[PDB]
Design a binder for these strands. Structure first.
Lengths: 323, 318, 323, 318
DNA sequence: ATAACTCTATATAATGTGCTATATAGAGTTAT
DNA sequence: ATAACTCTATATAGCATACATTATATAGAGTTAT
DNA sequence: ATAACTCTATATAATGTGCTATATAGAGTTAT
DNA sequence: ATAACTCTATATAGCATACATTATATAGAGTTAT
């Protein structure tokens, strides 16, 4: 079915906007890896043979990769074949059995899904107690950022996407922000966010120095060069990669040099403040709805994963036992 | 074989009644639209060719239609085919992928599935405070309808199906409405919707002045002519466009005539009370399970967007 | 596949205790009906042809039978074929479509599932206010019955199955009864039931007159002949059919002669007292667990169908509206 | 072909690890029992003949085995076959129907699936009031185990899998136990079970006197010898028969030696605390949803029989 | 002449069984 | 030269559409008892 | 010699993805 | 003769196992550091 398959991949290329760029990136990434392994192991990479895919999955595990990562591989390989008319590796008894086995084997060696390191009020006040005083342009900007981040629980991409026009001024000069936190359709279109007398002051400065207010198609956050000189733009926002940096560079300021070699959530990442505001909100007995919403989350099983080591969430059994 | 297909479809038309009348209306509406696009481009309408279907869908999207209508067209084309015993247009990559792309391209340019303007307690109470005083038959009917809509959360289509024989009472004197079929259920079990003492009265007055109780099998709701005379029927229902107009009329009453925009949902509509009651209940702190039994829902997902605090500014301001 | 089918039905006959006698009865009943219709309509009854089964289902509906009844037919026909190696009528597009259609059509003409006519406290006191005084042996017995029935919510079959040994004597001479209300395995084995100072007195008499206490392998309830003379037995209980009669004969005493011609729950049936005690228990805000259990019910959707026209159960919306 | 079958099964043995070790133990235990019955009656053990399988099942039932064991045999025989790529013995009327008949015949003669004797709060409190005072290592271990069992509702198999590295604290100073795999779940997500301040102490004392914290990857629980010396290990777990004996020993302590009957559940067992805690929670009025999060259950059915009032005598006595 | 529909069309939003018992009218059975 | 990014590519955590109907939304054109 | 296991066996009870983003170390890019 | 059933057969309301594992229950036989 070479002509069938040819037609299929042309279909795939013609309507490639059917998937997100990130999806294609991961697809490409898995194929390069699978292909490179087939080459090294003398195997045909396309179509993929059950037995070869199985050996690979084990090679992935022996590489000490996580279950969820091995899934992404299988997943990408399955889609490739499903999208080129060939049988999916998953629908093979040897790949179904081995994934199952590897899954069980890994969870039984302590495979732990990780999450972001909480950036809670305790850290906000702390970093605040360390920078509200500096005249450093990148220090005032970075303070605003973690101010917005923490206050609003907005996704990093949403903080970047922001523009000066998107900012209002409420009760006692408080601030508000017309946003958009939904990959649309049956959801919301936007949401509007408000600040506190605290982070409203922090941002004020950013505005004051950045001088960004000058061209309102401008974005609130912009790069700040080594001379401590900002650089507005209405056509370019700060890279997610940078926002992640403000978080990491900040953990370092307080905790210093990368830690316990090995990686993954060693410092605060872009989701830390959301993971942080959540617990705090839960720690003041707020509401899961007030929260779930407060962060735009739609299907709770995640928020809960965040507030799980908290005493509020201990469980009916501990309640009973402490009569 | 073209022979089963002639049969499979003939077999479908034989028991058309297994499907909503509105399912047929859309199937034929779609086939019409499609066959017309095929006739224009010199293409075979059936069986559909994946590439033809894909050009059609892109044509729709170019016509500026909603992602939801475009999907409606595809789903009808998929039912025709599948129930024919053939393979679904969606069964091919050209179609599968193009759809995703149209959605993605549309919803990444804004587009959102809208929802009706909410009709909540405050709205009810205001309309009632004004209409309560009318001795007009239309007014008494409309008010009773608006109360049931909001009280029960029933869909218009379902309220129009209420026959007099369907009402009963709790011992407390509250009206009970038996509900057979619904968008989400068709059983001899059905539901029993309880009205408030206030809404029960509103209904009682409507029955009284209308005479719909003359025949138990008469529909609860009917037309009332310019001379104020009702027009009860056991065979014909008050029309779906009528039930819709009660909602826009009422809204016209309080806020006046609607925009020149030609947009949808500029006033209340058949779904307004369902959406609004849904959240009045959220606000009231009702339990999602309860909010669910209200709107007869069986999952917990529409409930969810119908109502998407200052919790953080409060935590920060100490 | 005549030899295959022959083998299949021999299988069916060999292990026929695989199903309850009632099941076989209904099977036999449906086949007789289906067969008689095929004869009258010149059709082969076995195997059943989609088109013929479909015509039948419609004939069933035009007979004005209920949806649930038509299901029982299809159901029995499906099992026959499934249990003789032939295709099930259900797996045919014409029988799937027509059942669906007939279902919808019937629910849209007012097809109402019925249930038992409640035998609530109000009726107990009433009938009690009318018989506690009679010296009639069948009147004292019948009073005990509705006493047990109502108090315990036991299934009719359970009341019949009772034996004198199965009765104890608690706080202030109250009575108790070791029962069994489960078609076993992962359930209970028995349950023990207690009476009130009321129905404990009522039953006492039964015991006194019936003279049943004389041979404890005896059953509490026994037949009472026209001379008003009881007849004990340790090997024969009162027929469910009789117990149903005590209920019906009783409604008549209060409401007289069968009613509104047409049938189904016109008087109290064997389930009336359970349907009755339930609402009463719910009307005193008892508990669904206290109840569901009180009647042995395991999966709530039914108890609720019983307490649905009650003001307690009105719904969050009426609560809100009455602020 | 006999050729796929040789492969399908070879393929299963290759990745035996996809299944619980206990799944293999039973598969082989069953095949043993079956093959032995086949050898005795001059029958082919594989592939199984429906009629042979049916005689086997009736043989088991004649041996007086439980409906549940008989089903275990059939289910193992069905897995062998199905995972072989062949048809299941259960796939034939002879087998399907005989099973139903054995159940029906058995459960209509009494037979009930038993459940462990309950170990509730009162039982915990009593055992603790007595054992609390022991300075003995065994006693300190057993008490800490019994507390976790009851607190967490975890299965023994799962508690035996707790490694020191797995414990953490709430800020309140309560022990948190991370739970990877369970009878009902195998994910890198797993659960975090919180102990009470009281049970945390009990655990702390056990860790302290045992030295299991010498190696984070050491299992929480281990053997303690006659001389009171523990025996921590990162490779070997305290045995399932040991965990079971803690329960019977404890019970022996309070009520003395068990009947001569040879029946099951005459004393507490690995499941006792799960059953009892389950109902302590019912009594306490806990919410089934909550009772569910307790015992990690995802449906709502076992919860239900673990605890099967005088409501009517109260309504009647006025 | 018109209020108040109804109809028709396209456009778009919203949502989720198989075995056993029970009810009941009828026919049959016994003892009074 | 580097601070301060922006990109790349991979590891992994975190969602969200697709199916198959069934209904609503609403303007326009026709209907009928006044 | 033995307490306190462990093992082995049969017997029996109990229960429930595919696409997109994010994290992060690295390599590349500009302006200071 | 009938009251008082018991059976039959059908209409219909009301449940509850089967799948495929994965675990527990527990006695007996062996193990090892004391």
């Amino acid at each position: 079915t070479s002509d069938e398959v040819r037609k299929n991949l042309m279909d795939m290329f013609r309507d490639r906007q059917a998937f997100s760029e990130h999806t294609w990136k991961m697809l490409l990434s898995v194929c390069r890896s699978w292909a490179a392994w087939c080459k090294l192991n003398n195997r045909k990479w396309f179509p993929a043979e059950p037995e070869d895919v199985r050996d690979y999955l084990l090679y992935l595990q022996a590489r000490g990769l996580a279950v969820k990562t091995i899934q992404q591989h299988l997943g990408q390989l399955n889609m490739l074949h499903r999208r080129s008319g060939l049988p999916r590796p998953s629908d093979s008894n040897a790949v179904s059995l081995v994934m199952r086995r590897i899954r069980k084997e890994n969870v039984d060696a302590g495979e732990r899904a990780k999450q972001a390191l909480a950036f809670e009020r305790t850290d906000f006040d702390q970093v605040r107690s360390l920078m509200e005083n500096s005249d450093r342009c990148q220090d005032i900007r970075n303070l605003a950022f973690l101010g917005i981040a923490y206050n609003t629980l907005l996704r990093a991409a949403e903080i970047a996407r922001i523009r000066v026009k998107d900012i209002s001024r409420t009760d006692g000069g408080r601030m508000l922000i017309h946003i958009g936190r939904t990959k649309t359709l049956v959801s919301t279109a936007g949401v509007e966010k408000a600040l506190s007398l605290g982070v409203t002051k922090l941002v004020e400065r950013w505005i004051s120095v950045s001088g960004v207010a000058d061209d309102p198609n401008n974005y609130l956050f912009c790069r700040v060069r080594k001379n401590g000189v900002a650089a507005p733009s209405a056509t370019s926002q700060l890279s997610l990669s940078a926002l992640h940096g403000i978080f990491g560079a900040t953990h370092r300021l307080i905790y210093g040099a990368k830690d316990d070699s090995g990686q993954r959530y060693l410092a605060w990442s872009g989701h830390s403040a959301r993971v942080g505001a959540a617990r705090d909100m839960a720690r003041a007995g707020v509401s899961i709805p007030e929260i779930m919403q407060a962060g735009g989350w739609t299907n709770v099983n995640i928020v809960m994963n965040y507030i799980r080591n908290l005493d509020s969430e201990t469980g009916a059994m501990v309640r009973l036992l402490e009569d």
